[PDB]
Design a protein around this ligand. Structure first.
Ligand SMILES: [Mg+2]
Lengths: 187, 194, 297, 114, 213, 184
RNA sequence: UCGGAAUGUCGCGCAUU
RNA sequence: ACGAGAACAUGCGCGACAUUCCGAA
């Protein structure tokens, strides 16, 4: 915690407020914080050779936000990740609590990267997908199908998005990936 | 003795009301209903009354003050306006969303391009039940204070609440359901708003 | 001594802060309630000394449907992090938690069962400067939006005349508002005062241990005997004087240090209405009388 | 979910024996017309003009069956004529909005599976 | 404080089209629905549209600062009327034009004659080398529709009221000939302002001498 | 900023068809009278003016026209947007033409394809915006050329088959606002 | 009857924060 | 004598620009 965090965190827009034992407080760019949290989970699994997992709470707050409020909310997310089998990360709000593998692969590698590459190949379209997905109406799924037909993307990826939206606990991962992508593409 | 007068009524948003916090309005953090913060109503009424009467002793006596040597308790406790149950059912019917997304543009003066903005506004049909407490401190000064309150309400009805109401978003109308002296034996029957 | 229970259902979000405006808290201590009651008595032109001497109120405690919550006893646990993070115990389980049999997962479930409110932070702005060639300034106010069936309750132990005085005072305080932004839309609540049988039976129990329910501080002589073998949490209580007559400008109260609710003492002590005003035109009263609940450890 | 199943079963890309958006537009325009007619109005039961124009939509469904076999097989497989029948039987706004939603899901799935 | 309220009807001359997303009429057909107040599902001219068009026209008429970058660099009359936001030089807007809602008279007259309050105008674009026509549908409020328009003028300087209302005269005239929002260059949005009342609801300012048209 | 408004009477030599979805001619939902869409007039003048002058071999984006037509009918190029000095209004059915039609047993439209019968007149209304004092007259001559072309050519429908030609006569040329001289 | 079924652009920015 | 008290999340901003319901029969 004290030493190898400098090496692991290297190359990120991150200042390590404190490591000091089993815990860790980290401040940086939101995307760099999430990426280094995943890299940290992998490196910690390598360091402990399994046999030990750490839970995390990741928050996204603007600057000049009350630092007391910031740390308290991040600790609240950490506590939300604590409940259960404890091998979880609460990303942003308390509804987005995912296993480390689920966040690393199912949300980012499997969903965020292909969606981002599709968007680059072709923002408001992501917004309307979010509006259709967050609602539970079946005809919202129908409208999502129509939108994916209209999107002029690779139709294999639109069928993949349909499959992700249909499956329970896969729609949540898709929503989190789309929110990550939207936050990635802003001004 | 000390008296508290309760003024309970409705605020009918005659236009889309946008009280910021894309560009979402403030909402009750639990029920996610649109709300009008009490600070918003108090500040708008205070600004309008200050403009009308021109801080002044009347303004500080009404809305409170913290200046040295002139600490005054706020006689007007303007509680948060909540999305009323009647309008809640009126919007549960017709399957109407309480808020709406209004798209707006801004043509530049040089390149003639526009920046689209999606501002959220509470739908016209909404009604927020408001409940404000007037703290009768000086029995002599109650009449003038209520006259100033009525003047501020009249100005607000010809004005807008929070948001860019100079562009139309925020006009409201008050409907005083009842005025009753909840605390004390003060006579509030002759007192009225609007 | 009558021991009426008062239930407070908050219509609007309520702003409580331990240290800052943007900070939000779900309950307040007995002192903060007493300061409101004292302000209300002064406004209502009621008698101050009677309420000062007789009333013994407790910290405001969370309550939801089918449950009343009490502060976690600071009792040694003969799986401890779940107890440490736990804050409030249901009344029906309270004596249970005193005897034992409460395990880590059950305590965690009790902590999750706390269905009282939802903290949030509303951001507002000040335009008092833009007119005078200036600019607006944003400020954050924390608040707690209580759930429809939830709210804050507190017991009061006084004479019949004291209880009637409390009834009138809380009737006025319903519209006066309790909180740190009561004049800006927050803190509005409605109260109902009645005698609760479960609490009367719980207080009727006389165990070997005494548990504080109110933010209390013993007089020095009583503190000599009470502090032995005691397990407690000593909260620092500070604030600003709120009165038009105290001084020209608002000044801070003298820092006070009082035992938090739930602190367990093997020797009871009667508290004191301490004076935390210095060079003020009136004496500011901070409540520290102890409302005791006896239990068996 | 029945619309997606019907569209998938009729896959062959050829959908509904050659049905396209250009064949659908002629009737779906009337469908969305009556949809706007009900959406503007606020009443639990169907307005009489809505009933009359829905009957006209049904006979237009039959006429489009006569015009192109692809439209005809679309209507017989998706039961949309039977759906306008049953909603006329119910004469309520909820059901007819549900039927317009059903047709929207049908065309959406048809576009997606192409 | 004195506020001068103008209430009247803005009458459409050629199909008025203020765009905006939402629950589209003729779902899957039109590509530019008109902005409709969700409560009544009636076409409505947003007051922001009227204010922006009037401000742009008045700025063009008075004069444009060469290479202007922001709205707060306009003429002092423009900033005084429609508001300014210069950092440390903020002037509160005197014109508080509300959304012009659909009038009840035009509601009842369009209920008669079986009007739908809107038309789905068909247009198309033709290329210059391939001569291929690409069609399109745009919703328009039918010209017979009239909107109850309601604006408020704040009296902050007694001396400058006459100049402010003269500038409002110029802006209203320009907007009357110019098109309101939409593709009015192709004939979508010609409007005419009919004024019913210019009265000082609050205050004591003499508004009898004031006329905006 | 000055606006010069010209109001004139299009007179229909042979029956014209601008119907939107042959298809019935486009009719005003309010007056139920045949109406010449303004966008059709504007597009026809712009296309005729473009084809009259020399053009680049490929106009993919529809915006690469001659600078005079570009400033007259507007721009869409990213960063070089010019507002159209010419605003075209919808020419509705003239009151005089309508009354002449009720005088006889003559309908406003015929079947041939719903074609607005010949002899009808539409009151067209055009606005020119003054942006360059030294350019106003040069733009007006291009508008005249366009008008002249629109007299020789048609306006919508099967024009190459002999339907849709009209003639432009101007009742008055006056500046409706501004210090610009109308009689010039 | 056959085609085209919208397309090109911005897609919030600027004060306080 | 309620970490209190005073404070509008507000100020400026057009969903807008280019577009033949048309190619032929
Ligand atoms: Mg730890």
């Amino acid at each position: 915690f004290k030493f190898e965090l400098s090496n692991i965190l290297k190359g990120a827009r991150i200042s390590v407020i404190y490591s000091g034992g089993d815990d860790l407080f980290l401040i940086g760019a939101w995307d760099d914080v999430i990426s280094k949290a995943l890299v940290l989970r992998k490196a910690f699994t390598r360091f402990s050779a399994g046999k030990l997992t750490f839970s995390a709470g990741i928050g996204m707050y603007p600057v000049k936000y009350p630092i007391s409020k910031m740390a308290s909310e991040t600790g609240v997310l950490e506590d939300l990740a604590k409940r259960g089998e404890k091998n979880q990360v609460a990303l942003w709000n308390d509804s987005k609590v995912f296993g480390w593998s689920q966040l690393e692969e199912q949300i980012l590698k499997e969903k965020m990267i292909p969606l981002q590459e599709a968007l680059t190949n072709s923002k408001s379209f992501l917004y309307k997908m979010l509006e259709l997905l967050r609602n539970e109406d079946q005809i919202n799924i129908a409208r999502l199908a129509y939108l994916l037909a209209r999107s002029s993307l690779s139709e294999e990826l639109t069928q993949s998005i349909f499959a992700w939206s249909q499956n329970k606990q896969q729609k949540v991962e898709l929503i989190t990936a789309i929110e990550y992508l939207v936050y990635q593409i802003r001004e | 003795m000390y008296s508290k007068i309760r003024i309970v009524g409705k605020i009918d948003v005659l236009t889309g009301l946008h009280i910021g916090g894309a560009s979402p309005v403030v909402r009750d953090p639990y029920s996610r209903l649109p709300i009008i913060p009490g600070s918003s109503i108090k500040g708008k009424m205070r600004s309008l009354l200050a403009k009308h009467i021109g801080d002044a002793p009347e303004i500080l006596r009404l809305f409170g003050s913290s200046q040295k040597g002139a600490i005054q308790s706020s006689r007007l406790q303007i509680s948060d306006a909540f999305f009323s149950k009647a309008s809640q059912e009126e919007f549960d019917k017709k399957d109407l969303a309480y808020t709406e997304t209004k798209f707006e543009n801004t043509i530049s003066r040089l390149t003639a391009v526009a920046n689209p903005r999606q501002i959220e506004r509470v739908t016209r049909g909404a009604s927020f039940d408001f409940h404000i407490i007037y703290n009768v401190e000086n029995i002599n000064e109650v009449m003038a204070d209520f006259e100033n309150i009525k003047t501020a309400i009249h100005l607000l009805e010809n004005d807008y609440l929070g948001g860019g109401g100079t562009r139309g978003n925020g006009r409201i109308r008050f409907v005083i359901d009842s005025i009753d002296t909840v605390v004390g034996d003060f006579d509030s029957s002759n007192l009225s708003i609007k | 001594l009558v021991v009426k229970l008062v239930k407070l259902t908050f219509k609007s979000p309520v702003h409580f802060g331990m240290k800052r405006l943007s900070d939000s808290n779900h309950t307040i201590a007995a002192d903060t309630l007493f300061s409101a009651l004292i302000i209300e008595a002064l406004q209502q032109q009621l008698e101050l000394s009677h309420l000062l001497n007789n009333l013994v109120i407790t910290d405001l405690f969370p309550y939801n449907k089918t449950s009343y919550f009490l502060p976690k006893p600071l009792i040694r646990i003969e799986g401890y992090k779940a107890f440490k993070k736990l804050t409030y115990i249901p009344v029906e389980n309270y004596s249970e938690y005193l005897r034992g049999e409460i395990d880590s997962l059950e305590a965690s479930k009790i902590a999750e069962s706390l269905n009282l409110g939802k903290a949030s932070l509303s951001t507002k702005v000040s335009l008092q400067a833009v007119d005078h060639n200036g600019e607006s300034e944003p400020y954050s106010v924390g608040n707690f939006t209580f759930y429809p069936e939830s709210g804050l309750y507190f017991l009061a132990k006084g004479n019949a005349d004291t209880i009637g005085q409390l009834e009138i005072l809380m009737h006025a305080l319903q519209y006066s508002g309790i909180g740190g932004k009561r004049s800006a839309g927050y803190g509005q609540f409605r109260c109902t005062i009645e005698d609760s049988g479960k609490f009367d039976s719980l207080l009727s129990q006389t165990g070997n241990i005494a548990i504080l329910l109110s933010s209390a501080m013993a007089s020095d002589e009583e503190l000599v005997d009470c502090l032995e073998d005691a397990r407690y949490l000593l909260k620092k209580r500070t604030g600003f004087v709120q009165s038009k007559t105290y001084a020209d400008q608002l000044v801070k109260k003298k820092d006070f240090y009082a035992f938090s609710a739930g602190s367990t003492f093997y020797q009871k002590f009667n508290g004191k209405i301490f004076d935390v005003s210095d060079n003020g035109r009136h004496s500011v009263y901070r409540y520290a009388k102890a409302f005791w609940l006896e239990g068996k450890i | 979910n029945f619309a997606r199943k019907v569209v998938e079963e009729n896959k062959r890309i050829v959908l509904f024996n050659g049905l396209t958006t250009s064949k659908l537009r002629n009737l779906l325009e009337l469908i969305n017309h009556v949809y706007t007619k009900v959406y503007n109005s606020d009443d639990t039961t169907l307005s009489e003009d809505v009933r009359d124009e829905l009957e006209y939509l049904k006979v237009k469904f039959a006429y489009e069956s006569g015009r192109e076999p692809a439209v005809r097989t679309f209507i017989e497989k998706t039961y949309v004529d039977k759906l306008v029948d049953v909603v006329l039987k119910k004469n309520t706004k909820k059901i007819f909005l549900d039927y317009c939603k059903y047709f929207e899901a049908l065309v959406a799935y048809a576009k997606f599976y192409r």
